[PDB]
Structure formats: structure tokens, C-alpha cells
Amino acid sequence: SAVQQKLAALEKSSGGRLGVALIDTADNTQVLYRGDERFPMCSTSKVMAAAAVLKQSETQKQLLNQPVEIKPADLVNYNPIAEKHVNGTMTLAELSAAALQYSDNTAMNKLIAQLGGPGGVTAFARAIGDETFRLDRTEPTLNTAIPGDPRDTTTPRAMAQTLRQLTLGHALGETQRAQLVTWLKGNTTGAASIRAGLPTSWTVGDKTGSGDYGTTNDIAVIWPQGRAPLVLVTYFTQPQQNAESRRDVLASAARIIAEG
């Protein structure tokens, strides 16, 4: 179609590999570009870890208030929030918000530990019907983004469907779903990605991701004005290991989709 020709031209101009999935919940139509190819998730995987903890809190009602100790040994390469609490505690709610809104890598590792390892995060995906998502490693090695490596990957189609279920569907309880939406809407790292290609009046909740091989990702739920919400996943990776991030590509992909 028209949108797919423009996305293909965008990809060609960028020198990388672009994957897009859009779900328009108004009629459940989909727009896919490389929708069934695997891409490295990098920090977009944090949404699944936070959601898995939220699902646990449907039974363990006070779980989000559980204090978790932050020790110097827990700190990894990027810990903007956890660093402020070393030798103190953060609750699981606070770690979830830090993982989602600041992309804190120590917070992600604490969430993974709460779930019993990367196997526990992947298990949650399977339980809500996502057979594609796989989390294999912890932070920071899950961001190596090596071409062809299936570890820590998903496909655009699978992530779009799963993000729809978590935020607009009923994979989580009502209180848990509302908390996830609130967290995504308060993301602080997304201003130059999907959001930058969309009308300023639209409300967006997103989670970015970046890694080696110039990997630049963003996944978002979009609430347009007076119109059904959309789910948009944009994944981008490049042939050179130390390639620079290309958030402009994600913005341009969103702009092309929003033109439809």
C-alpha cells in the first residue's frame, strides 16, 4: 500500500532495518512492515517485566509496597534513579516506575530477580498468549543486539498485540492496567522518538529502547483526540556495531503512519 511504500523508502534512506506494527483499535486493522522479523528489544523489554510484577500484585495485594534493598553491587551501567537510593531501599512500585520512566537498568534487574530470573519474565509473556517474546539475559548484556542472535528479541507484530492487551485489554486487573498506563504516560525518555512524529495534541505513553548496532526502539500507546486509541511499535537496527542512535527514524515512521 501507500504507507508501506513510504516506510520502505524511509528504511532505504536510513541504511538500517526498520520494523513497524500499528494496531488501530477502531476496527482492529493492522499495518505491518517487517512485522514478523525478529528485532532486539533492548529496554522495551522493561514493559514486560513491570507488567509481570503487576500481575503478581493481583494476588499479593501489598507487593508493590515491598521494600527492596539497593546495594553498591547491584548498580550496573545506567542507574539514574537507583543511584539516588544506594544503601537504602526502593519499593517494587518505585523500581517499576524507575525502570519504565527513566529506563533504569538496576531497577530492571531487581524486577527480573523478583520474577525468578529471565525465565520468569518470558513465562509471563507465554501466559498472556505471546509465544514470540523471549528474555534471555539481564542488564546490561541483553542490549548486545548482535545480528541474527535470537536472544532477547521479539517481532513488531507480537509486541504490538501484547502491548495492546496490557494497556487497552484485560491481561491485567483494572487497578494494575491503570497503573501501567499512568507509568507509560509519564515516560521521560521518549520526546525525540514516536512522540516527535505525532500531533502535539495526542496523548502518548511509550517505552524507548536502545543498544548496540545503533538499535533504536520505541513502543507506544496513542490516544488521539476524539478517536479510538492506537498501538504503535517501531524497531530499528543497523549493520555497524557502534552505529549512532537514530531516533529521527522512529519519529519519521510515526509521522508516515499518522498521515494515514
Ligand SMILES: CCN1CCN(C(=O)N[C@@H](C(=O)N[C@H](C(=O)O)[C@@H]2N[C@@H](C(=O)O)C(C)(C)S2)c2ccccc2)C(=O)C1=O
Ligand atoms: C557487552 C555488554 N553491553 C553491550 C550493549 N550495551 C548497551 O546497549 N547499553 C545501552 C543502555 O544501557 N540503555 C539503557 C537501558 O538499557 O535501559 C537506557 N535506555 C535507552 C533508551 O531508552 O533509549 C537510553 C538511551 C535512555 S539509556 C546504551 C545505549 C546507547 C547509549 C548508551 C548505552 C552496554 O552498555 C553493555 O553493557
